[PDB]
Write a protein that binds this ligand. Structure first.
Ligand SMILES: Nc1ncnc2c1ncn2[C@@H]1O[C@H](COP(=O)(O)OP(=O)(O)O)[C@@H](O)[C@H]1O
Ligand SMILES: Nc1ncnc2c1ncn2[C@@H]1O[C@H](COP(=O)(O)OP(=O)(O)O)[C@@H](O)[C@H]1O
Ligand SMILES: COCc1c(CO)cnc(C)c1O
Ligand SMILES: COCc1c(CO)cnc(C)c1O
Ligand SMILES: [Ca+2]
Ligand SMILES: [Ca+2]
Ligand SMILES: [Ca+2]
Ligand SMILES: [Ca+2]
Ligand SMILES: [Ca+2]
Ligand SMILES: [Ca+2]
Ligand SMILES: [Ca+2]
Ligand SMILES: [Cl-]
Lengths: 294, 290
């Protein structure tokens, strides 16, 4: 059951995409089968970024290898992150559907598809325009979505500025056909607030909580968060899984600042210290409270 | 300090190349910077292999980004494994030379280049043809080489069948310019229940040699070399090379036994006993030869 197909970026330097997601999932006892959508020198925050990008043909080629070897029924979980390719984003829906069919033919429980719609952050799109719409279409097929507040804003067309606006953005996701939505953080300038929204019933259960806001811009935080969320949600209800994943991020951001990745440090300095405290990836030193809304 | 550039394969399914190497090195506290020479569905033993292979331009393009962002002096270790491309094998020499330069300019400890000359196993050359000659050239620049007995044999032209012949093959690597050689295992006609390893350390022109055995476990495994070289880089960071070989051998013995108790089934269970990757249940004896 602890087998994930993870479709995200690969970077040589630093910690984003599959490099960031893989180590935490492995520590939690998951086999991570990674399809690397790009193979780049580093994340898009650096003045230079070089390397290879998948086209649709490269993606369907990997899929043929997985299909022919009868590996598709293995994937209890599908996790998508950085793709930044309209054709490959569109193709994920067929990939997930083909996995669901292979699992049913093997008498396995249905897969769970976690979609992190990786498009941008700090108010800037760092992925192409056509990709926004392809994510709206893919999200109709996702079980869980983990947008940052920028992505939630551009998908729903609702400016996520507060709890109320986060809820309207999350209701859009549910109407779209995504049952479970985490808006991972949004605007007490010393804390960030998050929303978990679960639509069955036609009813929606909603939860909130807060985490300390650390001064500085981090990269890879969403990627570690979604990987952590898959790992905890395998054996926790989603509210607890969110709280534990928030706790993991707090430990990792604090370790990064301690090793000298403050607000004013270099991009290299601010790379998440994903490997520094492996025990704290499985067992965070705090678990954020995730409290029902009325 | 604990920063490795790892030039090996990526596979979606299973545990070879950077999939065998990365999790152990991360558990030991190393940042692993991976260049994925291929991105394939699975290792070469399955009925179907699909995926992307780098060309030279793809490799030198990645290098361009690493150079441009000033990352090259970070690499205290360079670890190469599966490449299976003559042009990239030859390019590694320039990549190491540029890292050596960047670290010397910055007054850092000399980089250590661990070359695993990945070409074949089980008597079969699963990699291309003139890759062999390219590895003989690259090995002129290696600090540590970790061939299997097949690779040691094809590179040196000595059939490695015992300790005498392992020493002849190692001596070839020393003459080519690699000071430190691990021939990871060979069978012995005269000792069928054991695999023997050799560690050979050329200095004065003197050579210190060490040997020992592990049990010869039934069956055929993949990823064993890749986890061995990664573990060796990890242990050799703080341990003398003899004790480092001993611990790496112990790690592999725990993994093979953990694989035996659990092709899809004979994949190395690399992530199943994270404790055993750092602190193996036992270390192999690695004893000096007189
Ligand atoms: N500056 C920060 N201070 C505190 N927590 C943060 C900070 N940046 C990120 N996080 C944590 O990382 C998680 C994911 O980060 P977020 O910015 O929401 O996603 P992304 O990295 O995808 O843009 C948040 O839910 C929060 O727990
Ligand atoms: N059948 C086996 N029994 C015991 N140890 C083995 C066996 N196969 C591999 N090993 C271990 O794994 C290490 C690397 O395997 P080896 O076969 O020498 O290289 P490769 O996997 O590159 O061919 C060996 O040094 C040894 O510790
Ligand atoms: C700022 O970098 C964005 C980014 C992310 C997600 O944070 C993931 N992969 C790659 C390749 C990226 O460039
Ligand atoms: C077992 O197949 C051999 C192999 C290895 C070395 O184990 C490494 N990478 C790839 C891509 C391989 O196919
Ligand atoms: Ca963010
Ligand atoms: Ca739906
Ligand atoms: Ca960010
Ligand atoms: Ca993100
Ligand atoms: Ca072998
Ligand atoms: Ca083998
Ligand atoms: Ca090998
Ligand atoms: Cl012998």
């Amino acid at each position: 059951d602890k087998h994930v197909l993870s479709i995200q970026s690969h970077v040589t330097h630093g910690y984003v995409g599959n490099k960031a997601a893989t180590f935490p999932l492995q520590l939690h006892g998951f086999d991570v089968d990674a399809i690397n959508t790009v193979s780049l020198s580093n994340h898009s925050g650096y003045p230079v970024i070089k390397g290879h990008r998948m086209d649709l043909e490269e993606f369907t080629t990997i899929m043929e290898g997985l299909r022919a070897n009868d590996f598709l029924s293995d994937y209890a979980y599908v996790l998508t992150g950085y793709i930044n390719n309209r054709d490959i984003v569109r193709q994920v829906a067929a990939t997930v559907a083909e996995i669901r069919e292979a699992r049913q033919k093997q008498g396995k429980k249905d897969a769970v598809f976690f979609c992190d719609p990786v498009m941008g952050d700090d108010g800037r799109l760092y992925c192409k325009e056509e990709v926004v719409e392809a994510y709206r279409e893919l999200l109709t097929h996702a079980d869980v979505a983990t947008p940052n507040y920028f992505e939630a804003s551009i998908l729903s067309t609702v400016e996520v500025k507060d709890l109320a606006s986060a809820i309207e953005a999350a209701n859009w996701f549910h109407t779209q056909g995504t049952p479970t939505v985490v808006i991972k953080s949004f605007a007490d300038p010393t804390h960030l607030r998050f929303l978990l929204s679960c639509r069955d019933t036609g009813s929606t259960k909603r939860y909130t909580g807060v985490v300390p806001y650390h001064e500085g811009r981090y990269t890879g935080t969403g990627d570690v968060f979604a990987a952590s969320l898959v790992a905890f949600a395998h054996s926790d209800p989603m509210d607890l899984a969110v709280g534990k994943a928030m706790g993991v991020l707090q430990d990792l951001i604090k370790a990064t600042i301690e090793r000298g990745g403050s607000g004013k440090a270099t991009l290299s300095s601010r790379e998440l210290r994903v490997t520094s405290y492996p025990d704290r990836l499985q067992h965070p030193s705090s678990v954020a409270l995730v409290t029902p809304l009325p």
